[PDB]
Amino acid sequence: FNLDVDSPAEYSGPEGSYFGFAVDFFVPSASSRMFLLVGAPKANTTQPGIVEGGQVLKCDWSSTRRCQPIEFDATGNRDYAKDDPLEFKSHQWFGASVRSKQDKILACAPLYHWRTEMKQEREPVGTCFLQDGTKTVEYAPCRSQDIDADGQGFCQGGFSIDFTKADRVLLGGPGSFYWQGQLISDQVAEIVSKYDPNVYSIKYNNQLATRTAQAIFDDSYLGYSVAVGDFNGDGIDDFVSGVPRAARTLGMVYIYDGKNMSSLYNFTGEQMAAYFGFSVAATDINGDDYADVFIGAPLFMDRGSDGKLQEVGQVSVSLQRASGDFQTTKLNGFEVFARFGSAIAPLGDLDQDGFNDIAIAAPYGGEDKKGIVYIFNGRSTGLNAVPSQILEGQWAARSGCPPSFGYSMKGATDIDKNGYPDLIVGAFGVDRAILYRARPVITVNAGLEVYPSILNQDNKTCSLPKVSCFNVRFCLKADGKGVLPRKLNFQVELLLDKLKQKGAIRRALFLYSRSPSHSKNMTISRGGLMQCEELIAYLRDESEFRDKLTPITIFMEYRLDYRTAADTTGLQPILNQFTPANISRQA
Amino acid sequence: DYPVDLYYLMDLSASMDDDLNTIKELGSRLSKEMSKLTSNFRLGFGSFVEKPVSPFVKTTPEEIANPCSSIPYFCLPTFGFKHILPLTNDAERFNEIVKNQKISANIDTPEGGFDAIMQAAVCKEKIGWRNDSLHLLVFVSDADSHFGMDSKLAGIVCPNDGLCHLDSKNEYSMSTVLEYPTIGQLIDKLVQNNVLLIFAVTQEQVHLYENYAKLIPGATVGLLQKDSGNILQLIISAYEEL
Numbered sequence: 001f002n003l004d005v006d007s008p009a010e011y012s013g014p015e016g017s018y019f020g021f022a023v024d025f026f027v028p029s030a031s032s033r034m035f036l037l038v039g040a041p042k043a044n045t046t047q048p049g050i051v052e053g054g055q056v057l058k059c060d061w062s063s064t065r066r067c068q069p070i071e072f073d074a075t076g077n078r079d080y081a082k083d084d085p086l087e088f089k090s091h092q093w094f095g096a097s098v099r100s101k102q103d104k105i106l107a108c109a110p111l112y113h114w115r116t117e118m119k120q121e122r123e124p125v126g127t128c129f130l131q132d133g134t135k136t137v138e139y140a141p142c143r144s145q146d147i148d149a150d151g152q153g154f155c156q157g158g159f160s161i162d163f164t165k166a167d168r169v170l171l172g173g174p175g176s177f178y179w180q181g182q183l184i185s186d187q188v189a190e191i192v193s194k195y196d197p198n199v200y201s202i203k204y205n206n207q208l209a210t211r212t213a214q215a216i217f218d219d220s221y222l223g224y225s226v227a228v229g230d231f232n233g234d235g236i237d238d239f240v241s242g243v244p245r246a247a248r249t250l251g252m253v254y255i256y257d258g259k260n261m262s263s264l265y266n267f268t269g270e271q272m273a274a275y276f277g278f279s280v281a282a283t284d285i286n287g288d289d290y291a292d293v294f295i296g297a298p299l300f301m302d303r304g305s306d307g308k309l310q311e312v313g314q315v316s317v318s319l320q321r322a323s324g325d326f327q328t329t330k331l332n333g334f335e336v337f338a339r340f341g342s343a344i345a346p347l348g349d350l351d352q353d354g355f356n357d358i359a360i361a362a363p364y365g366g367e368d369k370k371g372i373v374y375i376f377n378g379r380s381t382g383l384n385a386v387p388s389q390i391l392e393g394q395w396a397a398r399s400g401c402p403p404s405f406g407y408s409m410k411g412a413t414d415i416d417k418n419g420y421p422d423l424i425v426g427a428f429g430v431d432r433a434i435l436y437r438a439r440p441v442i443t444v445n446a447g448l449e450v451y452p453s454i455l456n457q458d459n460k461t462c463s464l465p466k467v468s469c470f471n472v473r474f475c476l477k478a479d480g481k482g483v484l485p486r487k488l489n490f491q492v493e494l495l496l497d498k499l500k501q502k503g504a505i506r507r508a509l510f511l512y513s514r515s516p517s518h519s520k521n522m523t524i525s526r527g528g529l530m531q532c533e534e535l536i537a538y539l540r541d542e543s544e545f546r547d548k549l550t551p552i553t554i555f556m557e558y559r560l561d562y563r564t565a566a567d568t569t570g571l572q573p574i575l576n577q578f579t580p581a582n583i584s585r586q587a
Numbered sequence: 588d589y590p591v592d593l594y595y596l597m598d599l600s601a602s603m604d605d606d607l608n609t610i611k612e613l614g615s616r617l618s619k620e621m622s623k624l625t626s627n628f629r630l631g632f633g634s635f636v637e638k639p640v641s642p643f644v645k646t647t648p649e650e651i652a653n654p655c656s657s658i659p660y661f662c663l664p665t666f667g668f669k670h671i672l673p674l675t676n677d678a679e680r681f682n683e684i685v686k687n688q689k690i691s692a693n694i695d696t697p698e699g700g701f702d703a704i705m706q707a708a709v710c711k712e713k714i715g716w717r718n719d720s721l722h723l724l725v726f727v728s729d730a731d732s733h734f735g736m737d738s739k740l741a742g743i744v745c746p747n748d749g750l751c752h753l754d755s756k757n758e759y760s761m762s763t764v765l766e767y768p769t770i771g772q773l774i775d776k777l778v779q780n781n782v783l784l785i786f787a788v789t790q791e792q793v794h795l796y797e798n799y800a801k802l803i804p805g806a807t808v809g810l811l812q813k814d815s816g817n818i819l820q821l822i823i824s825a826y827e828e829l
């Protein structure tokens with residue numbers, strides 16, 4: 001609810017390049033600056049003879065909003081022999097998936113084709129480039145001697161990637177073994193050490209891979225999406241992957257152990273061709289240190305109130321337990337054909353309430369099919385089914401692809417050091433990426449005491465040149481959890497006997513202000529103590545109004561001056577949603 | 588007595604050489620019994636294979652013009668969907684087309700059948716659907732079929748709008764540009780045009796496609812045999828109307 005939609009950062013790349021097809025963060029060595037990583041897989045590069053090789057751009061947040069290309073590879077197509085090109089980097093879609101861990105940036109080219117070393121083929125084995133600062137290495141675990149469709153020729157390694165917490169890379173290859181799919185995991189120490197620009201098929205000893213199975217499992221697309229998390233309660237991040245065409249297009253999700261590549265748990269879709277497993281994510285949502293599984297089925301069709309089918313997409317929420325089981329619920333999308341569940345980005349604790357939160361995108365929802373991102377908060381019992389914030393697309397669809405706002409996103413990284421994790425949302429159809437900054441959340445506890453409750457018609461006590469008067473005591477306390485100033489300036493308004501509309505007969509007004517309303521600018525400090533203030537209001541005489549039946553409601557209203565509570569970046573805080581309002585009592 | 592339109596959608600993929608002669612015996616046989624229960628009979632024809640993009644077809648210069656290479660065999664190149672015959676009364680022209688049909692090829696067992704169904708459904712002009720008639724669409728293939736988001740591997744991420752995209756060659760021109768349609772999209776366009784989709788597959792593919800017919804309203808399933816008069820029993824028992 002606290003994402004700033006008033007002033008978001010708008011980053012752009014070359015037009016027609018699918019800028020924003022893959023997004024991620026960048027946090028290098030020590031306490032340095034932070035960056036946005038954006039993929040543009042259809043981008044023309046300067047590579048000799050390479051048309052639309054694609055690139056990954058490093059955009060700076062600090063200021064100026066300027067993007068700089070990351071040089072992963074400047075060379076053209078290597079030759080196996082004279083007039084015999086070895087590889088085809090044109091239209092390789094480099095930057096279709098970008099994943100970053102600390103000072104490491106991993107980008108891949110799923111449509112990279114490679115010619116066999118035995119004969120003249122053009123097989124899309126896929127390749128990745130890894131950058132650990134200066135050194136840039138190549139990574140093609142499917143570029144092997146296991147050629148042809150029966151092998152890894154159409155593996156398309158790097159279609160999806162992720163990092164574990166123990167410096168292992170997780171790669172998905174949907175085409176391996178006649179499109180059975182395959183997961184490959186290698187230690188980062190081995191990837192760079194065993195790299196050799198003169199060796200096209202490098203064999204890694206600590207490689208973990210899903211070996212080939214029976215022919216019935218062909219055309220399954222194992223590795224279509226990936227995510228990481230601990231599930232067997234040991235400490236080693238395990239491998240989760242969607243298998244959307246398994247079980248006769250029912251879709252499945254396979255879980256493998258992150259140590260010896262063994263199947264741990266299975267999920268199965270409940271509707272044919274719902275693409276159960278298109279997107280997956282793993283994050284602990286209910287504060288139990290057990291990572292939880294989120295499976296998107298963007299093509300899920302539900303039944304409407306009128307009995308007609310409607311494609312809305314579905315995400316299943318499965319809460320991990322120590323007893324090994326899973327508590328699974330299902331979350332249906334809101335808009336028809338929006339493909340709710342196409343992208344799922346763990347956000348961390350977006351609002352710093354003690355429970356992680358998550359975003360789910362419907363890239364083709366909203367007006368003019370521009371795109372919507374839904375924000376969901378966690379709680380003790382799990383994920384809140386109702387969204388607390390709706391991110392709207394602003395960019396209309398020029399002829400061709402729709403804006404696809406939300407199609408890829410990544411969270412759980414605090415890019416402005418404001419104490420709250422932020423969110424990058426890619427929209428490749430309009431070649432754009434947008435940074436939404438989380439606003440600080442102010443929790444306010446307001447109090448209102450009216451003593452006495454019963455006002456006598458003639459109780460003269462407070463000094464006056466003496467009339468029936470009473471004390472109005474209102475207390476105010478505020479706090480926040482993040483990087484916010486100490487001094488929050490409040491402007492508080494009080495209205496006596498509001499129930500009487502403008503034109504009626506009023507019966508209350510303060511003693512010295514001589515006015516039914518009193519304004520007061522209030523500087524209070526969060527965290528210190530509750531600051532309270534008393535003041536005296538009185539009732540009018542009996543002969544001035546015959547209306548002694550209309551109960552006199554004392555109304556107290558309070559607001560904040562955000563401008564003096566804003567940050568150096570102009571990020572204005574925001575109140576918690578269930579209790580921001582004013583309060584009322586009555587005498 | 589009531590007008591009826593019947594479009595014949597044949598799969599020209601590689602896995603259909605063993606079933607080709609059964610399909611031609613289905614064409615001529617269907618081009619006979621239709622004139623029985625009705626006089627207002629017009630039938631059409633269309634063929635499909637697969638989207639001509641990697642990884643579904645090899646991208647080597649020889650296997651593009653001849654995807655049956657390395658076997659070796661001569662067959663037609665890989666194409667998404669070709670609208671050959673608009674539905675008309677001339678039924679002997681229908682037979683002359685099915686006879687000359689040759690096999691094509693690709694790599695991955697499921698095909699782009701849904702692309703052909705979507706283009707034949709929405710195009711009420713280039714196919715020529717009557718105002719008030721029974722729009723029947725016979726679907727024939729001996730394997731599975733690709734649906735939405737499967738073209739992401741090929742590099743196609745623009746969804747299918749469910750519109751008429753037939754060029755001057757009467758082919759699916761926006762096949763390498765648009766994704767495959769989903770079952771939701773097909774359901775949304777088979778009712779706007781009111782089309783009854785008959786699935787005619789092989790034994791091993793019925794248990795799959797029958798669950799598809801459960802989702803798609805009005806769509807039924809059928810089995811392919813040497814005596815292909817079985818699928819004819821569907822249509823005759825589909826003229827019940829009422």
Ligand SMILES: *[C@@H]1O[C@H](CO)[C@@H](O[C@@H]2O[C@H](CO)[C@@H](O[C@@H]3O[C@H](CO[C@H]4O[C@H](CO[C@H]5O[C@H](CO)[C@@H](O)[C@H](O)[C@@H]5O)[C@@H](O)[C@H](O[C@H]5O[C@H](CO)[C@@H](O)[C@H](O)[C@@H]5O)[C@@H]4O)[C@@H](O)[C@H](O[C@H]4O[C@H](CO)[C@@H](O)[C@H](O)[C@@H]4O)[C@@H]3O)[C@H](O)[C@H]2NC(C)=O)[C@H](O)[C@H]1NC(C)=O
Nearest residue numbers: 180210211212213214215217222246252254263264265266
């Ligand atoms: C979650 O769900 C998923 C999906 O359901 C599930 O993952 C699958 O789990 C099933 C569990 O049964 C796995 O099925 C097993 O697969 C084994 C395959 O590995 C070996 O077997 C190959 C068998 O070849 C087949 O084809 C030939 C004809 O070509 C045929 O004759 C055979 O009978 C067989 O059908 C074998 O070829 C292969 O060997 C390779 O390497 C050698 C060199 O060493 C090379 O020469 C070969 O050419 C090949 O390249 C490989 O070693 C299979 O062995 C295993 O068999 C068991 O079951 C049968 C039937 O009950 C018994 O008779 C037999 O004795 C065994 O007990 C079994 O079928 C399937 O592979 C998984 N799929 C994956 C991992 O992708 C998860 O388990 C689920 N999760 C949980 C927690 O359950």
Ligand SMILES: *[C@@H]1O[C@H](CO)[C@@H](O[C@@H]2O[C@H](CO)[C@@H](O[C@@H]3O[C@H](CO[C@H]4O[C@H](CO[C@H]5O[C@H](CO)[C@@H](O)[C@H](O)[C@@H]5O)[C@@H](O)[C@H](O)[C@@H]4O)[C@@H](O)[C@H](O[C@H]4O[C@H](CO)[C@@H](O)[C@H](O)[C@@H]4O)[C@@H]3O)[C@H](O)[C@H]2NC(C)=O)[C@H](O)[C@H]1NC(C)=O
Nearest residue numbers: 231232233234257258259260261262264321322323324325
């Ligand atoms: C590939 O790796 C996987 C894991 O990385 C290996 O799977 C392991 O198999 C061994 C068996 O060889 C198991 O050890 C057994 O433990 C029993 C006691 O239970 C302990 O493990 C529990 C695991 O956690 C549970 O909960 C999670 C949910 O979070 C479940 O998913 C999981 O399945 C478990 O149910 C702990 O929670 C618990 O506290 C215990 O510590 C032992 O009883 C058992 O047998 C022993 O005793 C026998 C006689 O009593 C004796 O003969 C045996 O030799 C043995 O000593 C055995 O020790 C591991 O638990 C299991 N891993 C996991 C994570 O569960 C897999 O074997 C490996 N494959 C290869 C080829 O290397």
Ligand SMILES: *[C@@H]1O[C@H](CO)[C@@H](O[C@@H]2O[C@H](CO)[C@@H](O[C@@H]3O[C@H](CO[C@H]4O[C@H](CO)[C@@H](O)[C@H](O)[C@@H]4O)[C@@H](O)[C@H](O)[C@@H]3O)[C@H](O)[C@H]2NC(C)=O)[C@H](O)[C@H]1NC(C)=O
Nearest residue numbers: 451452453454455456459460461462468469470471473534
């Ligand atoms: C006629 O009007 C009179 C004035 O409007 C009424 O007199 C009021 O009587 C109530 C008791 O019912 C008093 O309330 C008490 O207040 C004490 C002391 O609180 C104060 O002290 C703390 C610090 O120690 C300070 O922080 C507070 O702000 C207060 O200043 C409480 O401890 C008691 O529990 C009790 O609630 C009022 O204080 C008193 N008014 C004044 C101005 O003194 C009188 O009751 C009316 N007659 C009627 C209605 O018949």
Ligand SMILES: *[C@@H]1O[C@H](CO)[C@@H](O[C@@H]2O[C@H](CO)[C@@H](O[C@@H]3O[C@H](CO)[C@@H](O)[C@H](O)[C@@H]3O)[C@H](O)[C@H]2NC(C)=O)[C@H](O)[C@H]1NC(C)=O
Nearest residue numbers: 014015016017018040041042043044045049050051052053
């Ligand atoms: C990346 O660069 C390539 C070229 O290296 C661009 O491909 C070019 O695309 C244009 C149209 O987008 C092609 O021109 C067309 O020619 C026809 C005539 O046949 C004309 O009628 C059209 O109006 C259009 O002008 C051009 O031939 C083609 N170039 C090559 C070498 O194939 C590509 O568009 C660039 N992409 C991005 C994102 O920058």
Ligand SMILES: *[C@@H]1O[C@H](CO)[C@@H](O[C@@H]2O[C@H](CO)[C@@H](O)[C@H](O)[C@H]2NC(C)=O)[C@H](O)[C@H]1NC(C)=O
Nearest residue numbers: 495498555556557558577579580581582583584
């Ligand atoms: C005090 O603030 C509250 C905010 O909670 C106001 O309540 C709103 O009342 C209007 C109409 O009376 C509704 O349309 C809004 O939906 C209410 N807000 C919420 C959050 O539900 C209340 O009106 C304010 N006090 C006065 C006197 O206006």
Ligand SMILES: *[C@@H]1O[C@H](CO)[C@@H](O)[C@H](O)[C@H]1NC(C)=O
Nearest residue numbers: 490491518519520521522561
């Ligand atoms: C409080 O400050 C506001 C501006 O925020 C001003 O309009 C108002 O006059 C001030 N009130 C008093 C009592 O000084």
Ligand SMILES: *[C@@H]1O[C@H](CO)[C@@H](O)[C@H](O)[C@H]1NC(C)=O
Nearest residue numbers: 711712715716717718719720
């Ligand atoms: C019948 O077809 C004619 C053109 O052939 C068209 O103008 C008319 O709208 C159609 N009627 C209905 C009910 O579709």
Ligand SMILES: [Ca+2]
Nearest residue numbers: 232234236238
């Ligand atoms: Ca583990």
Ligand SMILES: [Ca+2]
Nearest residue numbers: 284285290292
């Ligand atoms: Ca959990």
Ligand SMILES: [Ca+2]
Nearest residue numbers: 351353355357
């Ligand atoms: Ca939270």
Ligand SMILES: [Ca+2]
Nearest residue numbers: 414418420422
């Ligand atoms: Ca932040």
Ligand SMILES: [Mn+2]
Nearest residue numbers: 600601602730
């Ligand atoms: Mn086929």
Ligand SMILES: [Mn+2]
Nearest residue numbers: 602603605729
């Ligand atoms: Mn066959």
Ligand SMILES: [Mn+2]
Nearest residue numbers: 693695697698
């Ligand atoms: Mn195919």
